[PDB]
């Protein structure tokens, strides 16, 4: 038979609250900023401004602690940060496990991107959060980043007790944009890997991920992908930029599921999935397609659509009331997933 499909509502017409904010956003004069300028922009503008806004919402320093690790991956070591709640009078308490994969088009970023958000979340949800510095493109080609994310997931599962986590209490993988893509890969791998038999993932949250290389989009679905042309000039992410990030990632085979998670032979028996989409985004429809395929494979699933706002608008414009709602609904989706192993 066929399957259901999430269609329209003026998804790419500017949200009334976003148009004025966008009108005041400073844009670089470069027609196409080079990679070093994009990395510097996140380092110098996006994360400092995000942290300045989030600073008054951070929990008291008594309510959480941070632990940094350096773990082996193929051919190098990877930095891992853990976010551990410490407000209970019981210093031996163990908590559910949240494994978070940061954004950046596979080519940008590290734990700094979500550091404050995870400090907040670990206190709000009473979970141990984990964030990892997976290797970036183009210096490392796909699937190096995905393999690092997976090695970190294995490390966090096996070593949970050493930072007061217990994945039997809940084990949620979550990722943003390219990090969501890498977590989609990791969730399929983990489903099939007997390593995880005793500590399986219990849930997954993703925000607006890429799901398939354009050159590997299955013919029968090419008609579903309207956003790539309709939103080809959308704020914060153009079609041109999507293609450039795919090129930087340089997978040997764009049809392989280790790059295009849409193309795993089976999407059955994945963790329950909370999917968050931005309406004004060239990557919108491949994400909606991935969600449709996961739902048709029998996996429990929730979708939230933010019409009229671009890719990652909540990371660049967190002071918007709408952006705060996006983060609140992220946390609510996490709470839903963790409620499947309630503590």
Cα angle 83, 177, 235 (rounded to 5 degrees) comes to 125
Per the annotation, the verdict on 15 as an active-site residue is: no
Per the annotation, the verdict on 311 as an active-site residue is: yes
CB contact at 8 A, 130 and 200:
no
Determine the Cα–Cα distance for residues 73 and 94; give it in Å rounded to an integer.
26
Give which of 184, 251, 260 is closest to 218, Cα–Cα.
260
Torsion angle, alpha carbons of 302, 306, 311, 312, to 10: -80
CB contact at 8 A, 175 and 207:
yes
Determine the Cα–Cα distance for residues 154 and 130; give it in Å rounded to an integer.
12
Q: Among the options 123, 148, 166, 281, which is catalytic?
A: 281
CB contact at 8 A, 201 and 184:
no
Residue 5 lies in a domain: no
Residue ranges in the chain assigned as alpha helix (H): 18-24, 35-41, 47-54, 115-125, 144-158, 178-192, 227-230, 239-249, 284-296, 313-316, 321-338
Determine the Cα–Cα distance for residues 148 and 179; give it in Å rounded to an integer.
11
Strands 128-132 and 76-85: antiparallel
Residue ranges in 25-143 assigned as alpha helix (H): 35-41, 47-54, 115-125
Residue 69 lies in a domain: yes
Q: Token pair of 103, please? A: 């954004």
Residue 150 lies in a domain: yes
Find where tokens 């940008």 sit: 108
Determine the Cα–Cα distance for residues 339 and 343; give it in Å rounded to an integer.
8
Residue 12 lies in a domain: no
Residue 143 lies in a domain: yes
Q: Find the CATH number of the domain harbouring 286.
A: 3.40.50.1820
Distance from chain centroid for Cα 298: 22
Give which of 100, 106, 97, 163 is closest to 126, Cα–Cα.
97
Q: How many CB atoms lie within 10 A of CB 102?
A: 26
Residue 273 lies in a domain: yes
Helix (H, G, I), strand (E, B) or coil at 108: coil
Backbone angles phi, psi at 105, to 5 degrees: 65, 20
CA distances to 211, 218, 259 from 215, rounded to whole Å, are 12, 9, 12
Q: Among the options 102, 213, 311, 314, which is catalytic?
A: 311
Residue 1 lies in a domain: no
CB contact at 8 A, 69 and 62:
no
| Structural domains of the chain, count | 1
Determine the Cα–Cα distance for residues 218 and 169; give it in Å rounded to an integer.
38
Which residues in the chain have their C atom more than 2.5 Å from the N of the next written residue, marking a break after them? none
HEC readout, 160-200: HHHHCECHHHCEEEEEECHHHHHHHHHHHHHHHCHHHCCCC
Q: Among the options 131, 142, 177, 277, which is catalytic?
A: 177
- Measured in angstroms, the resolution is 1.8
Please state the length of the chain.
Answer: 343
Backbone angles phi, psi at 60, to 5 degrees: -50, 145
For residue 25, the 8-state DSSP code is S
Q: How many CB atoms lie within 10 A of CB 213?
A: 21
Residue 11 lies in a domain: no
Per the annotation, the verdict on 68 as an active-site residue is: no
CB contact at 8 A, 331 and 324:
no
Give which of 250, 264, 137 is closest to 189, Cα–Cα.
264
Q: Could you list the residue range(s) of the whole structural domain that residue 47 is in?
A: 17-339
CB contact at 8 A, 80 and 132:
yes
Determine the Cα–Cα distance for residues 280 and 227; give it in Å rounded to an integer.
8
């Amino acid at each position: 038979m066929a399957i259901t499909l999430f269609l329209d509502e003026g998804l790419s017409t500017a949200h009334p609250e976003f148009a004025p904010v966008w009108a005041a956003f400073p844009q670089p004069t470069d027609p196409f900023p080079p990679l070093e300028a994009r990395r510097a922009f996140w380092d110098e503008v996006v994360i400092p401004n995000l942290n300045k806004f989030l600073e008054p919402s951070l929990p008291s320093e008594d309510r959480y602690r941070l632990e940094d690790y350096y773990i082996p991956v193929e051919g190098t070591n990877m930095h891992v940060r853990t976010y551990i709640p410490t407000s209970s009078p019981d210093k031996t308490k163990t908590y559910p496990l949240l494994y978070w994969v940061h954004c950046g088009g596979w080519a940008i970023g590290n734990y700094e991107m979500d550091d404050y958000d995870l400090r907040i979340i670990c206190d709000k949800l009473q979970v141990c959060a984990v964030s990892i510095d997976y290797r970036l493109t183009p210096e490392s080609s796909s699937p190096t980043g995905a393999k690092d994310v997976y090695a970190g997931l294995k490390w966090a599962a096996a070593n949970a007790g050493s930072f007061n986590a217990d994945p039997k209490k809940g084990f949620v993988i979550a990722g943003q944009s390219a990090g969501g893509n890498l977590s989609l890969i990791a969730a399929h791998w983990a489903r099939d890997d007997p390593f995880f038999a005793n500590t399986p993932l219990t849930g997954q949250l993703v925000q607006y991920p890429p799901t398939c290389h354009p050159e590997a989009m299955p013919e029968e679905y090419k008609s579903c992908i309207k956003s790539m042309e309709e939103c080809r000039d959308a704020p914060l992410l153009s079609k041109k930029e999507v293609y450039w990030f795919n090129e930087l990632a340089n997978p040997a085979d764009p049809h392989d599921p280790s790059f295009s998670p849409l193309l795993f032979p089976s999407h059955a028996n994945l963790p329950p999935l909370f999917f968050m989409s931005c309406g004004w985004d060239p990557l919108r429809d491949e994400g909606l397609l991935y969600h449709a395929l996961v739902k048709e494979a029998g996996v429990e699933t929730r979708m939230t659509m933010y019409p009229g706002v671009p890719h990652a608008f909540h990371m660049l414009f967190r002071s918007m009331k709408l952006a705060q709602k996006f983060q609140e609904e992220t946390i609510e989706g996490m709470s839903w997933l963790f409620s499947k192993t309630p503590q």
